[PDB]
C-alpha cells in the first residue's frame, strides 16, 4: 500500500465487567490516543482520572460537570446491568457442543512413533478442558495443545496432539469437558 | 471476571474512518455501518432478539472525530506508530476431501485499523462467498480482524491469505493447503 501520510487514532471504550452474574459490576471507561491510554473513569474510583499527562485536561473538564459524573456513577445500573440483561439469554446462556474427532496426523516424522490428533471444534463458550489417556491413565507428558482459538463467529476450536509410541492392544482416549455437556465426551483410537 | 461487554469506538485521520461496536467476551454482538446508517448484527438472530438505534452511534462518532483533532494538536501532532499484524490461517473444522469447509484468516495485534486482505487460490484472487469482520478491540488497544473463505477441499489447491499493512514492507502471504 502507498499513502505514508501520518495517521492519528482516537479510541473510546466502555467496559462492563460482571462477576457472579450481576452481583458485582464495574464500569471501566477508557480514552486512548494512538496507542496511549490517556484518561479513564473507573466505577470503583467514582471520578475521571488522567492516566498520562495528555488526559489531564479532559479529567478536569469532565469531573467539573456534575450531571456527567452522576450519570457515570449510576451507569453500572442504567448501562451495564441493563445491557447485560438485554442479551443474557443468547450470550451468557449460549451453549454449543464441541465436535470431537481423533485421527493420526497426516504427517508422521518418526518410524515407530504416531502423533495423534484430537480436534475439538465449533464450540461455545471458550471454557473447555481436553485430556489424553492411554489405557485409561491420563497422559501428562508429550501433549501439545494449539491453545484456544476464537473463530470470530461466536464459535471456538482447539487442537490437542499426543506424542505416542504405540503397542498393539493399547487404547488411546481423548476426553473433552465443556459446559455444553454433562458428562465428558470421549473418542478413542486403538493401536 | 465472569463476563465483559465492551462498547468500543474509534475515529482515524486522515482516512476519516470511524467505527462503533459492542462485543461480549471478545465476540462481536453488532457494529454500526456508518454509510448505510444501520446496525449490523454479527449473528442474524441477535437482531430478532434486541435492537440498537444506529443514529446514536453516529452522534458518538462525530464527538470522537472532534476529540481526535483536538488530541492531535494537543500532542504536538504526534502520529501513531504502525504495528504490523500477526497472521494465521486455519480451517474451522478438520478437512475431508470434497467436504465443504471454511478457511479463516486471523489478522491480529496491529494498528492503525487499516488493512488490505485478499484470498488467493493458486495465486488468483477469490471473492466468491467471502466475508469479514470489522476491527475488533484488544486489551492492549491494538486490533483484530477475521476474513472467511468457504471452499471445497482439494489435493490440488493452494491458498494464501494476502495481507498488506503500513507496518509491513511488503505483502504478507500466509498459505494453507490440504
Amino acid at each position: 500500500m502507498g499513502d505514508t501520510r501520518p495517521r492519528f487514532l482516537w479510541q473510546l471504550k466502555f467496559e462492563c465487567h460482571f462477576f457472579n452474574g450481576t452481583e458485582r459490576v464495574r464500569l471501566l471507561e477508557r480514552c486512548i490516543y494512538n496507542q496511549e491510554e490517556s484518561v479513564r473513569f473507573d466505577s470503583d474510583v467514582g471520578e475521571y482520572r488522567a492516566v498520562t499527562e495528555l488526559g489531564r485536561p479532559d479529567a478536569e473538564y469532565w469531573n467539573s460537570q456534575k450531571d456527567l459524573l452522576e450519570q457515570r456513577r449510576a451507569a453500572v445500573d442504567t448501562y451495564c446491568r441493563h445491557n447485560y440483561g438485554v442479551g443474557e439469554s443468547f450470550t451468557v446462556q449460549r451453549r454449543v457442543e464441541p465436535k470431537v474427532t481423533v485421527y493420526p496426523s497426516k504427517t508422521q516424522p518418526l518410524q515407530h512413533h504416531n502423533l495423534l490428533v484430537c480436534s475439538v471444534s465449533g464450540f461455545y463458550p471458550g471454557s473447555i478442558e481436553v485430556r489424553w489417556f492411554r489405557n485409561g491413565q491420563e497422559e501428562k507428558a508429550g501433549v501439545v495443545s494449539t491453545g484456544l482459538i476464537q473463530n470470530g463467529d461466536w464459535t471456538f476450536q482447539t487442537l490437542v496432539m499426543l506424542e505416542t509410541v504405540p503397542r498393539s492392544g493399547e487404547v488411546y482416549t481423548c476426553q473433552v469437558e465443556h459446559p455444553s455437556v454433562t458428562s465428558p465426551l470421549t473418542v478413542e483410537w486403538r493401536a | 471476571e465472569e463476563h465483559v461487554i465492551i462498547q468500543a469506538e474509534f475515529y482515524l485521520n486522515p482516512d476519516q474512518s470511524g467505527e462503533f461496536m459492542f462485543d461480549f467476551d471478545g465476540d462481536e454482538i453488532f457494529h454500526v455501518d456508518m454509510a448505510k446508517k444501520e446496525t449490523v448484527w454479527r449473528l442474524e438472530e441477535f437482531g430478532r432478539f434486541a435492537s440498537f438505534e444506529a443514529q446514536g452511534a453516529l452522534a458518538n462518532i462525530a464527538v470522537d472525530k472532534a476529540n481526535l483533532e483536538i488530541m492531535t494538536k494537543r500532542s504536538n501532532y504526534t502520529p501513531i506508530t504502525n504495528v504490523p499484524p500477526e497472521v494465521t490461517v486455519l480451517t474451522n473444522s478438520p478437512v475431508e476431501l470434497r467436504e465443504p469447509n471454511v478457511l479463516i484468516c486471523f489478522i491480529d495485534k496491529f494498528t492503525p485499523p487499516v488493512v488490505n486482505v485478499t484470498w488467493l487460490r493458486n495465486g488468483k484472487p477469490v471473492t466468491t462467498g467471502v466475508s469479514e469482520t470489522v476491527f475488533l478491540p484488544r486489551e492492549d488497544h491494538l486490533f483484530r480482524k477475521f476474513h472467511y473463505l468457504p471452499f471445497l477441499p482439494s489435493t490440488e489447491d493452494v491458498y494464501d491469505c494476502r495481507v498488506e499493512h503500513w507496518g509491513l514492507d511488503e505483502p504478507l502471504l500466509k498459505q494453507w493447503e490440504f
Partner: peptide, 15 residues
C-alpha cells in the same frame, strides 16, 4: 421494541 442495547455518550473534550 425488542430490548435495546443502550450506549454511553461520548463526552466532548476541552482544547
Amino acid at each position: 421494541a425488542p430490548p435495546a442495547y443502550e450506549k454511553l455518550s461520548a463526552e466532548q473534550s476541552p482544547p
